[PDB]
Amino acid sequence: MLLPWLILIPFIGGFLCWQTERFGVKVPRWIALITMGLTLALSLQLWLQGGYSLTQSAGIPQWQSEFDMPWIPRFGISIHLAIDGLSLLMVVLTGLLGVLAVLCSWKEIEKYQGFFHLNLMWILGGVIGVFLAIDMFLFFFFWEMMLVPMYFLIALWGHKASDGKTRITAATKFFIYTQASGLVMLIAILALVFVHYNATGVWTFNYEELLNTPMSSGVEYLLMLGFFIAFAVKMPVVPLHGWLPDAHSQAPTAGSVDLAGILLKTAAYGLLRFSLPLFPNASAEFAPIAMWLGVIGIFYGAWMAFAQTDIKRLIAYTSVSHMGFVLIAIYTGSQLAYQGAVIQMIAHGLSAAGLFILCGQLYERIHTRDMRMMGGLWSKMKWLPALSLFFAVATLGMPGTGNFVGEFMILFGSFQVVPVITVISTFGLVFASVYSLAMLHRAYFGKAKSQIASQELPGMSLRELFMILLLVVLLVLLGFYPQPILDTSHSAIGNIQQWFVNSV
């Protein structure tokens, strides 16, 4: 009953951010702050009242909360939301990152700031809707819902130092990739619904009824491939990754845009919720190809991140490699690897959010993004290079941060299932250390390679320092005490895994 409000509070908040711009130009940032605060507080209350640590696995369907309302009764389409542990963790994560995105866009007050905030809130509400929707048409609708505010954020409010045409090019590349993949997913959804209708005779887009739909191996493989292509563009999975560094480089220079739209992983959750249960045999036969695609993604993302002269492109390719790890984890049959994948998703969200925020602050201070135009910035800036050192250490895979817990539980489960791919992925961890040290050496250590680098730069203010330190504390606590997260996601992960391994 709170899930409709979990989606509607961002949308009403964005409408109010647009509407209360007339009383002041410093007002819409406030209204955005309250609406993401209430969204985060509602998600936290759903965590507190859910009792996710005590609930046991009983098989799909098993939702801690549910909501249904008919939307298009001709096709059997309803606004059908449901929440369990995995969805709850993703919703709490996107609420926290939405609050951090509102905080990151602070002190940036100009005309049509309310429209920026409205686009931000609509992106975040669409992300929450993808995490909550458990009927296929509403899931697809929310899937394509975020991309229009995302497109207008990249194209209109993007990197102000760009030509103006490159921002439009990156936004168009991102939109075309994501929407063509979504359309292929819609073809798969439609064909699955028609197969179910030919089997039974009733229209349903509900995911619970579409489970155990009798179909042949070729048809199931094709439907799984359509779903996988949609989830592979947005994960990203190589070679469908090309939109990501260009969208990150041309995104609004605060980096709040990255946190709100580009950095959350609806694709891994989509694979876990709708690929493995809906098509278990097809996912079982597709597992070698997807695991090798994940291996290639790890090493390709590492080699790309090492070759970048741009910080933002570097961090985007770090995201590519870590999602290669998650893609290997998803197609195993291991509960341990799935729990590691959940921890990895949360920790990569936190760590990449910190990295992108710190890069935005660094660009604000030095007005350039070329690593060859700076050096020895440790001696010039008070707080930023040490926190950037911590976040490079976190994305490196260091114990004490949640990234290590995620990667290593993934690798333990994967080695129980597939040893060779696990070995190659650990050498991927070596490559990750290589690019993290390369970024640290090129940016903050050495001598100044330009005149702007050899100047005393102003320190971080209290708000941005406090949000960075909150991210640091959350990453350290996730590294040392990841048990509440595992207890939250345990029942959902057990349901997904027991469905996937018992039907093959």
Binding site: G242, Q335, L336, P399, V423, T426, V434
Partner: protein, 601 residues
Amino acid sequence: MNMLALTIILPLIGFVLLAFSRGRWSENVSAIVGVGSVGLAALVTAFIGVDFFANGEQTYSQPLWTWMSVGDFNIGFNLVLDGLSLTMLSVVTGVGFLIHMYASWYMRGEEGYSRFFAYTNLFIASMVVLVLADNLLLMYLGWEGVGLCSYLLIGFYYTDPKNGAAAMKAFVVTRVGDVFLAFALFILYNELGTLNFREMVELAPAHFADGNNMLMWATLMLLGGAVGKSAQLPLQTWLADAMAGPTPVSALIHAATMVTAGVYLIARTHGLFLMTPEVLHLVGIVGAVTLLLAGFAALVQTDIKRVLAYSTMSQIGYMFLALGVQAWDAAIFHLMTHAFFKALLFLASGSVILACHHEQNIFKMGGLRKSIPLVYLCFLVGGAALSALPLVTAGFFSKDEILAGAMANGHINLMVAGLVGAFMTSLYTFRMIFIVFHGTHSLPLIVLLILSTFVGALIVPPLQGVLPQTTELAHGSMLTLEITSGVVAVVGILLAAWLWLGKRTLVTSIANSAPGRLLGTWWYNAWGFDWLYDKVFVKPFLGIAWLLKRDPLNSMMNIPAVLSRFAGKGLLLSENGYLRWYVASMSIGAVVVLALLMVLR
């Protein structure tokens, strides 16, 4: 007892306080905070040892919380304390406190005083986590922590890019070792379902009754992690280049914390290694060859730092030889004594560097016995302990125990490798001493001077009950072993005096010869392993990064857009605006539609 968590927490508190101070505090306050955290850890270690010996040397366990729990995957955040853990903890805390006091004197007037002490406090905390961990994953936490702190401390002078390059090299080689260690963890958990050491050695003989290949793989990957952290073959190339950092960093890394971690890895997991005898013999062979190559390389170095680095490499090779011949007590005894005298040697070389300037070549300096007498005495005592001078130094008794253990287990080849290594150790050590020193009573220096003598050999680690007893040698055979080791060290000292103390004509004639020049160039570059690793790993990595620097997968996914633009431009040629062509196109389409209907029918 029940204060091991305090021995971890106090360096952590010091690291957090000194990092968040970020240079705002005075040098005195930052100094007392850092050295007080490490000294309080040492004092709590002393109280823990007193309580441990007050009981019947029984193993203590302090489970703080549970780290991870996914089904059967139950990784605990528990500390353990036995004789081996107490030995390594006391060595780490005490020698780290001495090095911290020396650095409190030494780092005065330097940028990043508090940053240095924060990094060294995190180093101490990481190594205490490493030695106190009851399971392999918490030990991996400590392993990665000491790797990260070594990277942060080697490249402490970040303004020079050479120090940063050396730090990145050390981190990358140690991370390759840590990936091998991760493979060991994955195999052990997949086979036995636990990572606790006692549970692993209890469960392994029952599980591996039919097949032993997975236990062999697990111990081989444990050995790979050990040689990654201990700078042995084939992951030893980082140690010589890690000399870019300050001398307290070098003393900490080469004596207290980093290179000693592989020895603790093999000793703590000795139960698994005893069930794979070939892998343990490989440990011994790796230690023997590593000590031989390090002795060859230390003979031709032109810097005090590099001589001491390859000396550390050879002594860790001695420890690995002792582990491979099942002389565990000898290995840990040599660990403690080598920590003492190698810390003494590195702090004395730091005083040499401070007293002189610009980090001169060893041939530029000469006749320094008169300007600095106490530093010369510290170098003499450290060199005598390193060269195993009989009955005066603790290193003599340590190498005596190692070689006697190699004798008693029927390892003749490793014994003679150790004897050759001791001869050359005396040779290169007193070569450096007689080249540098021929031609104000600080407390840590005095304490390590006392501990480098036989007073250090009076301290015996309480390993009875943890590690198995080495088989005892016969009295006559061990007496001839003592005599042979003593005269080998003595003629090494005498050859170093005849060879480099004086006109130095014969060494000049040997070095200027063409085979002499070739061998000197070969041994100066650590037998060409840096060149080979560069050409085999670093060059193709940079080549692939340059070949892929403009995203090829993005281009082969962007070619549909190129085809779309080309086809659209081609189709726009039909819209020429001519009405007669439009009529012609309608008639062509009529012909096509009619022909298609007649063909398909």
